[PDB]
Amino acid sequence: EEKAKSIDQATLQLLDKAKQDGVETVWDRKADMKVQCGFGSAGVCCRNCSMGPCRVSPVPGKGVERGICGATADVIVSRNFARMVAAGTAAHSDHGRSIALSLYHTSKDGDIKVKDENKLKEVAKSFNVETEGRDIYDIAHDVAKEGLSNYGKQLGEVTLPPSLPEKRKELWRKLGVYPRAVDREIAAVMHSTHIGCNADAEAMIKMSMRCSLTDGWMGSFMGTEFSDIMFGTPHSIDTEANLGVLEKNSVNVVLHGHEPLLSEMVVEAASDPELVELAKSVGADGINLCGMCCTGNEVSMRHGIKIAGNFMQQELAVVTGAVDGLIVDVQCIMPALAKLSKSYHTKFITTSPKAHITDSIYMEFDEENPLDSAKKILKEAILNFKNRDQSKVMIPELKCKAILGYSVEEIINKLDKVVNTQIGPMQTVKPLADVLVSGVLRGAAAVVGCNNPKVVQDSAHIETIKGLIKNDVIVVVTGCAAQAAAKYGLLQKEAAEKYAGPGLATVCKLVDIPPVLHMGSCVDISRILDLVGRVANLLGVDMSDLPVAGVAPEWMSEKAVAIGTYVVTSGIDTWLGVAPPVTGGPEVVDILTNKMEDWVGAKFFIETDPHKAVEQIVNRMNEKRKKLGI
Amino acid sequence: MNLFQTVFTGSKQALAAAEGIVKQAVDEKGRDYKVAFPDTAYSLPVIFAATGKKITNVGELEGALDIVRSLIVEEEMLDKLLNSGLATAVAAEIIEAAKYVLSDAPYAEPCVGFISDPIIRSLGVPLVTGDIPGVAVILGECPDSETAAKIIKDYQSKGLLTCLVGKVIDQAIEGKVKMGLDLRVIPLGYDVTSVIHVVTIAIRAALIFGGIKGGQLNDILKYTAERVPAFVNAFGPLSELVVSAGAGAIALGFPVLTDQVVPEVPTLLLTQKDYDKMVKTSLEARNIKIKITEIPIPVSFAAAFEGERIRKNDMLAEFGGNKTKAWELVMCADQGEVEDHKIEVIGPDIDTID
Ligand code: SF4
Ligand code: SF4
Ligand SMILES: [Ca+2]
Ligand SMILES: [Ca+2]
Ligand SMILES: [Ca+2]
Ligand SMILES: [Cl-]
């Protein structure tokens, strides 16, 4: 009768417990919202000044046509869209900015240090920083200074990655969307969306495209590249996923958020002899560290830390009654966790001055003394195990194995296994390019995205991934979408025979990989751009000429909008499972889902049905294959 | 055009060719004329492996054309290419079967054509023990006869069986190669379809040694892929028909390596332009590890030169026989009598001969 809440049995079990406990969840608050405002849902409501609030008609020819200022529905909708990109870009901007500042404070006998010297030497080449006969920390600081300039330089040209084809750069230049400093483009969009500024849908949407580029090729890239320098480049690693990872007799410390420095220090803190003994003093087996959302992906990729769950599972993790400490930093942390943690012994600890949540324990993460600060927070979670009500604990016995760490460096290393020593070249993406041109693999898709109560949890993610791998399309995943697959069991070597098509199953067996490749967090989507870029450069074509696609089956965050925008602007078609608020703007719908193709060689596709989406992705990929002659 | 349409084109060409020669047999010999290969208990091996049915007359050979048609499904998915490659193989067998119908002696020397079942049994034991590490299927034309002979003589030196089809037969003759079943170098034929008789060696090996029954195509293709150490070496320009045959070889699990630029497929279809590396690439591509002994001698040393017929005219020196006194012996002695590597040639040497 009522639509299912989720496809995961562990999620469905804890949802029943939440009802019996009397607590409210995101699914319950969705029902409370009832019918959602159509004006806001169509994007035709404007609040960019105090002359309104204005609400024009989404159906042209009837109702109120213009806003008080004169803005038409297309103007209102295009500005509303722009601001989402600018907000999404800002979330990834501060993320990478913080990583770069950490790189600037690295020392040989310090809490934060350079782990991957080889990666730093390569990154230093792109930023024009010398490496010959110099201290790795002196290079790291000069690189950090050059990287930080990309955020607010007002003169000169910005440094872009080598994987970005020159054809794509020239296309942006001629279109007028070449990126500038990161914070500069955010201000540019915010200024033009102000009352009495831009009133042209095409120009506004182009401003968002320019802004979104500073996220994917600058904010996220540097965030990913510098994280690999300081914490290590990820490689194929095993781990367990789903809420079944929590242990009843151990202290459970769940890390949620996005910033990787705090989670890297809580991992090291879990290995301090004093803290391991304090856990035993309280009556625990040990310290069971778990992750959720990006911060969890960033730790499972590098240290194989177990994943508790994705975005909409964050409330149900507390409902298990086994989370002693829930340490959060920034982004995608539902404020409900403060009210929910009151009904349990769980301690909700906020650490970033960027994300303060009312009625929550606030323990600021001292970046000057990071390891000491991490130990102080972890100690509080350990001591809280004393207040655990073991009789009311209920951790569903449902976990799944998964393989991740599939960075571009790791994928290239694995592809070397299928290269002949006497013929083929080494450490290049050629094996992947060869399989795509031949036609063994119909194409390569990137399923990324969040969880939305408008879609059954994980339903569209699994249906979409399944359908693509069945049609010989290798799938790469990141963020909550990657976790959704890890929970189902698609991130396993044995998933190739079970779900992959004829060609993909052959490639999986030869290269020895699962049919779905976990490439990391949403910031790690820059690795997908890097991979697709290398394939394009190796074949001497632009990214728009390859049979590639991006999918966001379930998405909410303004970050997903910026991600989609920079993916389409980079030349990769993107399918959206959740419809953005553009319905009321006919010109905006035409631009996003049609005219855009003429500007960047790619377009948006809105499809809520995942079965129809895979049909469209395959047909579109084939169209691009026929044009290229492959 | 892409690899898929190139395979589908050559397979359709192979069907058209088989349709033409089959009509010639119907019109000249009638639908009741008996069709059979020289000494074989599996009728037409490829058709018998795929369908498990034996073809005995021209009328039944006409019906086998529908097997070629059914295997060609023009859809761009790996399983369809491989089936299209097998359609080329079934068509090649139909063409080769009709060749024996319309001619008393279809093959001329040095070509062998169809390989008899006892020969398959003869090569079965040395394949298992590893005496024959691989079967090099060389097809096409080399830039010159010097390169063709160097590659054959190198494979023969490794003891790998080398089967030639196309102009490489004429090039090997000019480049002075020693051909013969015992010499491990067998020329099948000049036509492209002649490559089917090696494919039948691998299929019959699965039926004979593997003990697989006719009709179990998936099990026969597994045996050839895991047990028959075969690979193809296509030289010179590749036609659409040849690329379809390459897909058929890939269907049996045999990698195809060529000197021409083609859409490569890792560990399946590779491109080596350096002829001085071809042998090493081919062995690596089919996991063939050669246990080299490295004896310091100026002449070759391999199982292919066993049972050599050194006759009077081609001979320089003779020892033993009803001609002169000759003997051999192995003795057991202490470490004092034996001085490890020590070669003492008491008496005259072959240089003294005139
Ligand atoms: S402010 Fe706009 S979107 Fe919100 S309820 Fe009012 S008309 Fe709807
Ligand atoms: S900018 Fe225009 S449409 Fe927006 S609230 Fe003001 S008057 Fe209304
Ligand atoms: Ca960079
Ligand atoms: Ca592993
Ligand atoms: Ca602190
Ligand atoms: Cl590369």
PDB file of C-alpha atoms in Angstrom, chain A residues 31-210:
ATOM      1  CA  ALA A  31       5.342  12.546   5.212  1.00  0.00           C
ATOM      2  CA  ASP A  32       4.865  15.587   7.513  1.00  0.00           C
ATOM      3  CA  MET A  33       5.822  17.918   4.613  1.00  0.00           C
ATOM      4  CA  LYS A  34       2.861  16.511   2.595  1.00  0.00           C
ATOM      5  CA  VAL A  35       2.387  18.152  -0.859  1.00  0.00           C
ATOM      6  CA  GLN A  36       5.534  20.239  -1.587  1.00  0.00           C
ATOM      7  CA  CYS A  37       5.130  23.796  -2.985  1.00  0.00           C
ATOM      8  CA  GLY A  38       4.840  23.531  -6.799  1.00  0.00           C
ATOM      9  CA  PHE A  39       6.190  27.083  -7.283  1.00  0.00           C
ATOM     10  CA  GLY A  40       9.348  26.094  -5.392  1.00  0.00           C
ATOM     11  CA  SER A  41       9.405  22.616  -7.009  1.00  0.00           C
ATOM     12  CA  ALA A  42       9.187  24.150 -10.528  1.00  0.00           C
ATOM     13  CA  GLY A  43      11.768  26.842  -9.605  1.00  0.00           C
ATOM     14  CA  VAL A  44       9.328  29.740 -10.264  1.00  0.00           C
ATOM     15  CA  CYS A  45       9.490  31.264  -6.786  1.00  0.00           C
ATOM     16  CA  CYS A  46      11.996  34.141  -6.260  1.00  0.00           C
ATOM     17  CA  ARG A  47      13.200  35.605  -2.863  1.00  0.00           C
ATOM     18  CA  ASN A  48      16.314  37.465  -4.153  1.00  0.00           C
ATOM     19  CA  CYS A  49      15.093  40.689  -2.515  1.00  0.00           C
ATOM     20  CA  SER A  50      12.346  42.135  -0.257  1.00  0.00           C
ATOM     21  CA  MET A  51      10.077  43.435  -3.060  1.00  0.00           C
ATOM     22  CA  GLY A  52       8.483  39.940  -3.058  1.00  0.00           C
ATOM     23  CA  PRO A  53       8.422  37.072  -2.340  1.00  0.00           C
ATOM     24  CA  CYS A  54       7.424  36.630  -6.041  1.00  0.00           C
ATOM     25  CA  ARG A  55       5.822  33.514  -7.599  1.00  0.00           C
ATOM     26  CA  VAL A  56       5.178  33.426 -11.366  1.00  0.00           C
ATOM     27  CA  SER A  57       3.236  30.699 -13.260  1.00  0.00           C
ATOM     28  CA  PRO A  58       5.118  27.482 -14.324  1.00  0.00           C
ATOM     29  CA  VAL A  59       2.622  27.039 -17.211  1.00  0.00           C
ATOM     30  CA  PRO A  60       3.255  29.841 -19.789  1.00  0.00           C
ATOM     31  CA  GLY A  61       0.367  31.868 -21.176  1.00  0.00           C
ATOM     32  CA  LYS A  62      -1.602  31.852 -17.899  1.00  0.00           C
ATOM     33  CA  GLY A  63      -1.322  33.297 -14.393  1.00  0.00           C
ATOM     34  CA  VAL A  64       1.305  35.830 -13.255  1.00  0.00           C
ATOM     35  CA  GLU A  65       4.030  36.009 -15.934  1.00  0.00           C
ATOM     36  CA  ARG A  66       6.691  38.270 -14.361  1.00  0.00           C
ATOM     37  CA  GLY A  67       8.139  39.081 -10.914  1.00  0.00           C
ATOM     38  CA  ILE A  68       7.784  42.521  -9.272  1.00  0.00           C
ATOM     39  CA  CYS A  69      11.137  43.616 -10.848  1.00  0.00           C
ATOM     40  CA  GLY A  70      10.154  42.176 -14.263  1.00  0.00           C
ATOM     41  CA  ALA A  71      12.024  38.861 -14.045  1.00  0.00           C
ATOM     42  CA  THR A  72      10.382  36.194 -16.246  1.00  0.00           C
ATOM     43  CA  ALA A  73      10.004  32.507 -15.187  1.00  0.00           C
ATOM     44  CA  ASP A  74      13.120  31.614 -17.215  1.00  0.00           C
ATOM     45  CA  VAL A  75      15.143  34.315 -15.419  1.00  0.00           C
ATOM     46  CA  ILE A  76      13.834  33.249 -11.968  1.00  0.00           C
ATOM     47  CA  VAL A  77      14.478  29.519 -12.666  1.00  0.00           C
ATOM     48  CA  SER A  78      17.972  30.099 -14.188  1.00  0.00           C
ATOM     49  CA  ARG A  79      19.114  32.249 -11.218  1.00  0.00           C
ATOM     50  CA  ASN A  80      17.735  29.693  -8.714  1.00  0.00           C
ATOM     51  CA  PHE A  81      19.686  26.983 -10.574  1.00  0.00           C
ATOM     52  CA  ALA A  82      22.878  29.105 -10.624  1.00  0.00           C
ATOM     53  CA  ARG A  83      22.778  29.689  -6.861  1.00  0.00           C
ATOM     54  CA  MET A  84      22.647  25.894  -6.247  1.00  0.00           C
ATOM     55  CA  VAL A  85      25.826  25.457  -8.324  1.00  0.00           C
ATOM     56  CA  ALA A  86      27.522  28.360  -6.470  1.00  0.00           C
ATOM     57  CA  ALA A  87      26.534  26.810  -3.111  1.00  0.00           C
ATOM     58  CA  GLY A  88      27.710  23.328  -4.189  1.00  0.00           C
ATOM     59  CA  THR A  89      30.991  24.795  -5.473  1.00  0.00           C
ATOM     60  CA  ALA A  90      31.465  26.555  -2.086  1.00  0.00           C
ATOM     61  CA  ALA A  91      31.096  23.287  -0.130  1.00  0.00           C
ATOM     62  CA  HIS A  92      33.877  21.605  -2.164  1.00  0.00           C
ATOM     63  CA  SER A  93      35.918  24.862  -2.206  1.00  0.00           C
ATOM     64  CA  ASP A  94      36.246  25.098   1.614  1.00  0.00           C
ATOM     65  CA  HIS A  95      36.932  21.328   1.677  1.00  0.00           C
ATOM     66  CA  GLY A  96      39.968  21.578  -0.637  1.00  0.00           C
ATOM     67  CA  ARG A  97      41.048  24.920   0.888  1.00  0.00           C
ATOM     68  CA  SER A  98      41.361  23.216   4.300  1.00  0.00           C
ATOM     69  CA  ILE A  99      43.374  20.307   2.766  1.00  0.00           C
ATOM     70  CA  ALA A 100      45.767  22.791   1.098  1.00  0.00           C
ATOM     71  CA  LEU A 101      46.256  24.683   4.391  1.00  0.00           C
ATOM     72  CA  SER A 102      47.138  21.343   6.069  1.00  0.00           C
ATOM     73  CA  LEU A 103      49.715  20.634   3.294  1.00  0.00           C
ATOM     74  CA  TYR A 104      51.247  24.086   4.045  1.00  0.00           C
ATOM     75  CA  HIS A 105      51.761  22.993   7.723  1.00  0.00           C
ATOM     76  CA  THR A 106      53.487  19.607   7.109  1.00  0.00           C
ATOM     77  CA  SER A 107      56.713  18.662   8.954  1.00  0.00           C
ATOM     78  CA  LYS A 108      59.006  15.603   9.217  1.00  0.00           C
ATOM     79  CA  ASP A 109      58.445  15.203  12.981  1.00  0.00           C
ATOM     80  CA  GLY A 110      54.891  16.569  12.955  1.00  0.00           C
ATOM     81  CA  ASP A 111      51.345  15.208  13.297  1.00  0.00           C
ATOM     82  CA  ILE A 112      50.638  15.835   9.571  1.00  0.00           C
ATOM     83  CA  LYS A 113      53.309  14.655   7.081  1.00  0.00           C
ATOM     84  CA  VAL A 114      53.793  13.837   3.333  1.00  0.00           C
ATOM     85  CA  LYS A 115      53.224  10.083   2.817  1.00  0.00           C
ATOM     86  CA  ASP A 116      53.293   9.910  -1.021  1.00  0.00           C
ATOM     87  CA  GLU A 117      56.485  11.674  -2.155  1.00  0.00           C
ATOM     88  CA  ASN A 118      56.154  10.417  -5.755  1.00  0.00           C
ATOM     89  CA  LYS A 119      52.660  11.936  -6.100  1.00  0.00           C
ATOM     90  CA  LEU A 120      53.917  15.230  -4.645  1.00  0.00           C
ATOM     91  CA  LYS A 121      56.790  15.300  -7.176  1.00  0.00           C
ATOM     92  CA  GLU A 122      54.248  14.862 -10.043  1.00  0.00           C
ATOM     93  CA  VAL A 123      51.805  17.471  -8.657  1.00  0.00           C
ATOM     94  CA  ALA A 124      54.709  19.919  -8.154  1.00  0.00           C
ATOM     95  CA  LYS A 125      55.431  19.651 -11.908  1.00  0.00           C
ATOM     96  CA  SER A 126      51.921  20.889 -12.832  1.00  0.00           C
ATOM     97  CA  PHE A 127      52.203  23.858 -10.403  1.00  0.00           C
ATOM     98  CA  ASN A 128      55.691  24.722 -11.804  1.00  0.00           C
ATOM     99  CA  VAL A 129      57.393  24.031  -8.437  1.00  0.00           C
ATOM    100  CA  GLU A 130      60.993  22.711  -8.604  1.00  0.00           C
ATOM    101  CA  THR A 131      61.788  19.290  -7.059  1.00  0.00           C
ATOM    102  CA  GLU A 132      65.480  18.672  -7.971  1.00  0.00           C
ATOM    103  CA  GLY A 133      67.605  18.379  -4.805  1.00  0.00           C
ATOM    104  CA  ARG A 134      65.040  19.941  -2.429  1.00  0.00           C
ATOM    105  CA  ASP A 135      63.371  18.940   0.884  1.00  0.00           C
ATOM    106  CA  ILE A 136      60.047  17.146   0.331  1.00  0.00           C
ATOM    107  CA  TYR A 137      58.507  19.496   2.963  1.00  0.00           C
ATOM    108  CA  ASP A 138      59.903  22.616   1.238  1.00  0.00           C
ATOM    109  CA  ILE A 139      58.307  21.318  -2.026  1.00  0.00           C
ATOM    110  CA  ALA A 140      55.034  20.508  -0.166  1.00  0.00           C
ATOM    111  CA  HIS A 141      54.820  24.080   1.165  1.00  0.00           C
ATOM    112  CA  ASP A 142      55.547  25.689  -2.231  1.00  0.00           C
ATOM    113  CA  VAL A 143      52.905  23.398  -3.837  1.00  0.00           C
ATOM    114  CA  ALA A 144      50.372  24.353  -1.133  1.00  0.00           C
ATOM    115  CA  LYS A 145      51.076  28.056  -1.801  1.00  0.00           C
ATOM    116  CA  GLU A 146      50.538  27.541  -5.557  1.00  0.00           C
ATOM    117  CA  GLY A 147      47.403  25.478  -4.930  1.00  0.00           C
ATOM    118  CA  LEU A 148      45.938  28.041  -2.521  1.00  0.00           C
ATOM    119  CA  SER A 149      46.363  30.790  -5.181  1.00  0.00           C
ATOM    120  CA  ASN A 150      43.818  28.953  -7.405  1.00  0.00           C
ATOM    121  CA  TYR A 151      41.218  29.889  -4.745  1.00  0.00           C
ATOM    122  CA  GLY A 152      41.597  33.686  -4.786  1.00  0.00           C
ATOM    123  CA  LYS A 153      44.118  34.950  -7.371  1.00  0.00           C
ATOM    124  CA  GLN A 154      42.857  38.131  -9.128  1.00  0.00           C
ATOM    125  CA  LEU A 155      45.591  38.370 -11.823  1.00  0.00           C
ATOM    126  CA  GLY A 156      47.329  35.749 -13.970  1.00  0.00           C
ATOM    127  CA  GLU A 157      46.059  32.368 -15.203  1.00  0.00           C
ATOM    128  CA  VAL A 158      44.802  29.439 -13.051  1.00  0.00           C
ATOM    129  CA  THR A 159      46.694  26.098 -13.017  1.00  0.00           C
ATOM    130  CA  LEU A 160      44.598  23.210 -14.406  1.00  0.00           C
ATOM    131  CA  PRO A 161      45.352  19.421 -14.375  1.00  0.00           C
ATOM    132  CA  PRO A 162      47.381  17.788 -17.218  1.00  0.00           C
ATOM    133  CA  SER A 163      44.606  15.196 -17.827  1.00  0.00           C
ATOM    134  CA  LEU A 164      42.329  17.974 -19.135  1.00  0.00           C
ATOM    135  CA  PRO A 165      42.495  17.815 -22.997  1.00  0.00           C
ATOM    136  CA  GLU A 166      43.601  21.006 -24.775  1.00  0.00           C
ATOM    137  CA  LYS A 167      40.493  20.687 -27.028  1.00  0.00           C
ATOM    138  CA  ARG A 168      38.234  20.975 -23.941  1.00  0.00           C
ATOM    139  CA  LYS A 169      40.190  24.028 -22.667  1.00  0.00           C
ATOM    140  CA  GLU A 170      39.935  25.828 -26.050  1.00  0.00           C
ATOM    141  CA  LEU A 171      36.199  25.001 -26.229  1.00  0.00           C
ATOM    142  CA  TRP A 172      35.649  26.646 -22.817  1.00  0.00           C
ATOM    143  CA  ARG A 173      37.758  29.669 -23.844  1.00  0.00           C
ATOM    144  CA  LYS A 174      35.722  30.237 -27.026  1.00  0.00           C
ATOM    145  CA  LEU A 175      32.414  29.667 -25.161  1.00  0.00           C
ATOM    146  CA  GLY A 176      33.533  32.154 -22.437  1.00  0.00           C
ATOM    147  CA  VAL A 177      33.354  29.668 -19.536  1.00  0.00           C
ATOM    148  CA  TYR A 178      37.088  29.104 -18.836  1.00  0.00           C
ATOM    149  CA  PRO A 179      37.407  28.976 -14.987  1.00  0.00           C
ATOM    150  CA  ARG A 180      39.038  31.707 -12.803  1.00  0.00           C
ATOM    151  CA  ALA A 181      39.814  31.617  -9.064  1.00  0.00           C
ATOM    152  CA  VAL A 182      37.491  29.339  -7.037  1.00  0.00           C
ATOM    153  CA  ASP A 183      36.047  31.941  -4.603  1.00  0.00           C
ATOM    154  CA  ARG A 184      35.977  34.529  -7.441  1.00  0.00           C
ATOM    155  CA  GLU A 185      33.500  32.495  -9.514  1.00  0.00           C
ATOM    156  CA  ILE A 186      31.234  31.903  -6.488  1.00  0.00           C
ATOM    157  CA  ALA A 187      31.086  35.688  -5.929  1.00  0.00           C
ATOM    158  CA  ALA A 188      30.486  36.258  -9.668  1.00  0.00           C
ATOM    159  CA  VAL A 189      27.363  34.022  -9.631  1.00  0.00           C
ATOM    160  CA  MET A 190      26.078  35.505  -6.353  1.00  0.00           C
ATOM    161  CA  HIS A 191      26.516  39.029  -7.773  1.00  0.00           C
ATOM    162  CA  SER A 192      24.732  38.325 -11.086  1.00  0.00           C
ATOM    163  CA  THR A 193      21.854  36.508  -9.320  1.00  0.00           C
ATOM    164  CA  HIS A 194      21.272  39.711  -7.209  1.00  0.00           C
ATOM    165  CA  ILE A 195      18.160  41.787  -8.081  1.00  0.00           C
ATOM    166  CA  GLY A 196      18.493  43.883 -11.249  1.00  0.00           C
ATOM    167  CA  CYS A 197      21.555  42.100 -12.663  1.00  0.00           C
ATOM    168  CA  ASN A 198      21.426  39.183 -15.182  1.00  0.00           C
ATOM    169  CA  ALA A 199      18.047  38.571 -16.851  1.00  0.00           C
ATOM    170  CA  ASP A 200      19.070  36.140 -19.621  1.00  0.00           C
ATOM    171  CA  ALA A 201      18.708  32.347 -19.160  1.00  0.00           C
ATOM    172  CA  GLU A 202      21.574  31.372 -21.548  1.00  0.00           C
ATOM    173  CA  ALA A 203      24.070  33.839 -20.032  1.00  0.00           C
ATOM    174  CA  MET A 204      23.082  32.811 -16.470  1.00  0.00           C
ATOM    175  CA  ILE A 205      23.427  29.070 -17.161  1.00  0.00           C
ATOM    176  CA  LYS A 206      26.857  29.740 -18.784  1.00  0.00           C
ATOM    177  CA  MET A 207      27.947  31.570 -15.585  1.00  0.00           C
ATOM    178  CA  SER A 208      27.057  28.454 -13.534  1.00  0.00           C
ATOM    179  CA  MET A 209      29.065  26.280 -15.960  1.00  0.00           C
ATOM    180  CA  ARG A 210      32.169  28.487 -15.530  1.00  0.00           C
TER     181      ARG A 210
END
